[PDB]
Structure 1
Amino acid sequence: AVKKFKPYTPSRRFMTVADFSEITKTEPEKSLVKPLKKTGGRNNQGRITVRFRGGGHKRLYRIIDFKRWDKVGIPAKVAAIEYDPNRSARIALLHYVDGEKRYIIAPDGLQVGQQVVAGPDAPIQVGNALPLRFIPVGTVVHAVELEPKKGAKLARAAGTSAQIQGREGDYVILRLPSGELRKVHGECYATVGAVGNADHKNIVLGKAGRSRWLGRRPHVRGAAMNPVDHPHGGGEGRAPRGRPPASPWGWQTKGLKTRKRRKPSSRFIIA
């Protein structure tokens, strides 16, 4: 729902946090599965290549399953729904009848105790992953694969989800979270339902820090630097860019389409 605070301090008036009842249950990550020293670092081999990243609360990583086809047919009981710091969603831990456990970006609705599974036979109900071709046109599904056997890669951010628009050949049409209509293979898996924790889009960082705890360093405007630093830069006291909106690298930044034209990945898109 999102917690609100009385203004017993500015910023704390505008501040809001996520309701943690969905997760209220198992805060400590499963010592196996999640355990994975996660390496922080805002640059590659030397230089920074994504400005303004850095700092930000120590974060332990949690490995999730983005290809539930591992255990086809093997059902599992959702042991618990915990908080994952490395993502917008909430993951859910689930023990399989097999014994093996693992996390799954918890879908909106899924509840602890519910049984769930993955496969063709699999029943169409929130939490079960199936190959697209076997999923009722129109249903909402998330964590959609994009190419058979290559893992989930679509609609995984809290509250996101794509809708099955129709079949057509070995492919099926999908209106993705952005709204684009892409044809995706039939063998491509996906777990039924929406991502959940849709409230996310409503939390208000509130202060300047918080934005720091998230690991995002202060971002500085082009026109605030100088001729050398940026192209908007310079100008004897405050000025209107100088035309036309560009980036520190010098490419137009208002409307100039960037995706590669000759990309063979077209032919499967429409939006």
Structure 2
Amino acid sequence: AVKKFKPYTPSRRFMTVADFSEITKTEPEKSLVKPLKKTGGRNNQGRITVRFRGGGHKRLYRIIDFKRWDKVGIPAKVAAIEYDPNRSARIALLHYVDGEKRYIIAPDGLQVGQQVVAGPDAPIQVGNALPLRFIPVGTVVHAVELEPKKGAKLARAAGTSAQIQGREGDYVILRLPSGELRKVHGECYATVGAVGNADHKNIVLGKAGRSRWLGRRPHVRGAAMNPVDHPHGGGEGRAPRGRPPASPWGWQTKGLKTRKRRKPSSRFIIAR
């Protein structure tokens, strides 16, 4: 894991690349890819609604499967492990015996060669997807639906996971990858395991350009603008924030809690 470099240039010193030994196949499943329209941060009016985006290598989108109850009870053999340029994680190729192939988001410690199944049945194992109600408690799980039939949403990023800490009535208690404590519905499919590529968090971009390749462009500080531009613009040399610190648009950026309070969602949440 985590390939380093001799410093035969600066920026090649502290730089770091992932280890692709996991990656078993170097071109994707033409059947399962579709093209990715790159936004540039712009929305349906040619307006930038997210700052500092664009540039960066073109990507092909892998259409990946987050509902696993299409295929209930069918198994599949894990065919390949691939690079997915659109996510932290890696994707698994898996041929269902159905003859139907899909991509899956690859759990940690999932060999090529595994059979894998999805359903209320099904053994408690890496790759396997069940409703939450049949996962035994204290099981480490990932790629969880929030509400039934709606698709995996939680714990999908490289190294992420969730624990099933309990059950109460129709619902079950999870610790999220953020340590929030959430009730989720019995009938939500979650595939067991953590996600892995867990070493993802140690990569060191190492040089400016490598940040461009991921399509994020320079971020210039409020501090360095003029008043027209930012709450922190101005002041002759440097100068400190001179007010409670703020976003360009003017709301306070240290401590302000933005979660809408009257969300009904909130009955189902117990933590930080």
> What's the TM-score, normalizing by structure 1?
0.97
1:196-246 CA-to-partner distances (Å, cap 9, x unmatched) read 100000000000011000000000000101001000011111110111110
1:109-162 CA-to-partner distances (Å, cap 9, x unmatched) read 111110001001111000000000000100000001000000000000000000
Mapped partners of 1:49, 1:4: distance in 2: 36
| Residues 1-271 of structure 1 mapped to structure 2, 5 A cutoff | 1-33=1-33, 42-271=42-271
User: What is the deviation of 1:174?
Assistant: 0.2
| Aligned residues of 1:33 and 1:103 also touching (Cα < 8 A) | no
Aligned residue for 2:208, secondary structure, equals coil
Q: CA 1:33–1:250 in 2, change beyond 3 Å: closer, same or farther?
A: same
User: What is the deviation of 1:34?
Assistant: 5.1
Q: CA 1:43–1:11 in 2, change beyond 3 Å: closer, same or farther?
A: farther
Unaligned runs of 5+ in 1: none
User: What is the deviation of 1:39?
Assistant: 6.2
1:29-80 CA-to-partner distances (Å, cap 9, x unmatched) read 4443456666665443220000001111011100100111111111000110
Q: CA 1:50–1:41 in 2, change beyond 3 Å: closer, same or farther?
A: closer
User: What is the deviation of 1:25?
Assistant: 3.0
Mapped partners of 2:18, 2:158: distance in 1: 12
Q: CA 1:39–1:95 in 2, change beyond 3 Å: closer, same or farther?
A: farther
Mapped partners of 2:54, 2:209: distance in 1: 13
Aligned residue for 1:138, secondary structure, equals coil
Mapped partners of 1:242, 1:266: distance in 2: 36
Mapped partners of 2:200, 2:248: distance in 1: 31
Q: CA 1:141–1:49 in 2, change beyond 3 Å: closer, same or farther?
A: same
1:83-131 CA-to-partner distances (Å, cap 9, x unmatched) read 0000000000100010110001100011111000100111100000000
Aligned residue for 2:37, secondary structure, equals coil
Would you say how many aligned residue pairs link Structure 1 and Structure 2?
Answer: 271
Q: Percent identity?
A: 100
Structure with the larger helix share: 2
Mapped partners of 2:81, 2:99: distance in 1: 18
Mapped partners of 1:129, 1:21: distance in 2: 26
Unaligned runs of 5+ in 2: none
Aligned residue for 2:223, secondary structure, equals coil
| Aligned residues of 1:232 and 1:246 also touching (Cα < 8 A) | yes
Q: CA 1:36–1:245 in 2, change beyond 3 Å: closer, same or farther?
A: closer
Mapped partners of 2:204, 2:226: distance in 1: 32
Q: CA 1:66–1:40 in 2, change beyond 3 Å: closer, same or farther?
A: farther
> What's the TM-score, normalizing by structure 2?
0.96
| Aligned residues of 2:24 and 2:80 also touching (Cα < 8 A) | no
| Aligned residues of 1:110 and 1:127 also touching (Cα < 8 A) | yes
| Aligned residues of 2:33 and 2:61 also touching (Cα < 8 A) | no
Q: CA 1:34–1:23 in 2, change beyond 3 Å: closer, same or farther?
A: farther
Shifted more, 81-90 versus 17-26: the winner is 17-26
Q: CA RMSD in A?
A: 1.4
